[PDB]
Amino acid sequence: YTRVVWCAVGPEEQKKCQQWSQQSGQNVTCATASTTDDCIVLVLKGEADALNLDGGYIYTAGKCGLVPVLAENRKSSKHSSLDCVLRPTEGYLAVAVVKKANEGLTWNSLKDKKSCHTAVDRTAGWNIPMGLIVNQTGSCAFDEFFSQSCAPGADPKSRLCALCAGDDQGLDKCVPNSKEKYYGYTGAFRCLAEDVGDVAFVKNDTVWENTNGESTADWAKNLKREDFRLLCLDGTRKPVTEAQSCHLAVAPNHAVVSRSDRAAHVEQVLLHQQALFGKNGKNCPDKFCLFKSETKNLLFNDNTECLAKLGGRPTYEEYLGTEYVTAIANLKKCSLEACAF
Ligand SMILES: *[C@@H]1O[C@H](CO)[C@@H](O[C@@H]2O[C@H](CO)[C@@H](O)[C@H](O)[C@H]2NC(C)=O)[C@H](O)[C@H]1NC(C)=O
Numbered sequence: 001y002t003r004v005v006w007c008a009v010g011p012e013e014q015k016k017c018q019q020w021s022q023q024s025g026q027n028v029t030c031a032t033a034s035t036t037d038d039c040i041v042l043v044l045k046g047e048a049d050a051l052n053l054d055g056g057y058i059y060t061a062g063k064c065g066l067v068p069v070l071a072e073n074r075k076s077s078k079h080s081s082l083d084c085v086l087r088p089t090e091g092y093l094a095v096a097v098v099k100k101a102n103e104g105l106t107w108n109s110l111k112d113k114k115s116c117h118t119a120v121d122r123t124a125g126w127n128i129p130m131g132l133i134v135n136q137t138g139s140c141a142f143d144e145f146f147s148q149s150c151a152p153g154a155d156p157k158s159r160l161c162a163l164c165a166g167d168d169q170g171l172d173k174c175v176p177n178s179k180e181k182y183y184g185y186t187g188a189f190r191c192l193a194e195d196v197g198d199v200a201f202v203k204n205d206t207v208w209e210n211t212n213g214e215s216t217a218d219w220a221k222n223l224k225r226e227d228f229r230l231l232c233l234d235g236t237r238k239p240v241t242e243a244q245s246c247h248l249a250v251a252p253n254h255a256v257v258s259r260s261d262r263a264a265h266v267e268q269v270l271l272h273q274q275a276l277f278g279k280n281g282k283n284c285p286d287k288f289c290l291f292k293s294e295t296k297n298l299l300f301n302d303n304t305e306c307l308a309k310l311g312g313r314p315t316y317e318e319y320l321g322t323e324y325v326t327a328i329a330n331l332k333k334c335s336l337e338a339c340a341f
Pocket residue numbers: 128131132135322323324326327330
């Protein structure tokens with residue numbers, strides 16, 4: 001009733017969800033699925049209520065009638081006066097990252113190189129870079145641009161999955177969930193940090209969070225920021241300190257979605273859950289922290305300060321913006337208005 005069913009994607013989000021379920025005294029329970037698309041289907045069936053999504057899936061969900069409820073809000077130096085829950089969202093920077101030692105690699109010489117993407121259909125990892133590449137080449141053959149890639153969610157037998165590693169045992173190669181070693185923001189950056197790929201399409205925050213001792217994870221321990229470079233659209237290469245002038249786009253924040261008819265209820269519960277397990281929540285450091293999972297971004301990104309109210313009660317189109325929606329529509333015509341399920 002005043003109980004919310006959260007949809008976890010894959011085994012590790014299920015485990016985190018179970019812990020949250022427990023700490024909340026079953027005010028939140030869990031449903032699990034193998035992909036984000038399957039979780040979207042559970043919400044449409046009404047077998048789950050909500051999940052936090054990247055812009056690209058918000059577009060998929062919105063076509064099926066799901067609505068944005070609350071958005072991830074990370075720290076800012078502006079609007080700082082305002083409380084986090086009421087502060088507008090800023091969006092994140094979609095960037096292309098390479099190793100400095102890979103000299104002479106620029107945006108213009110990416111053809112036939114190796115790439116690392118968060119997952120097919122995601123904003124920074126797929127939609128922005130591939131929409132840009134389709135536009136620039138006048139061709140929908142994006143499956144042929146890079147020699148090899150790790151792009152979770154593509155055909156395991158295709159070259160877009162050739163660089164993906166699967167789990168500890170080699171199983172689940174290219175699945176779009178955290179079982180795949182190179183999945184998500186962190187996995188895609190690891191793919192580049194390990195020299196599996198020549199380039200990684202992540203967001204600006206990911207580089208900072210997994211370099212200069214910020215991570216402590218074995219593959220990221222010795223990663224230094226000066227050993228990386230951002231690729232700008234003008235054919236240039238800049239330090240990772242210069243993302244405000246060298247990004248592929250600014251992305252709408254990840255946001256919680258639910259069926260429109262369940263939105264008010266999901267919103268109410270979430271604001272209380274975060275009062276309890278949020279950044280300075282009553283129980284977070286001590287019993288459980290919703291926005292922590294050791295650099296793994298499970299359920300929510302680890303850099304989330306809070307989930308923010310939206311204001312202007314936006315539809316999913318208003319939320320994503322006409323810029324981003326037209327870019328997705330244009331790219332999606334390579335792979336006609338309806339819910340994809
Ligand atoms: C790819 O090219 C298309 C087509 O020019 C670009 O998309 C359009 O986007 C602008 C800005 O939103 C709109 O004014 C046009 O209406 C859109 N054109 C079409 C065909 O819909 C698209 O933005 C470019 N993609 C990228 C990543 O820059």
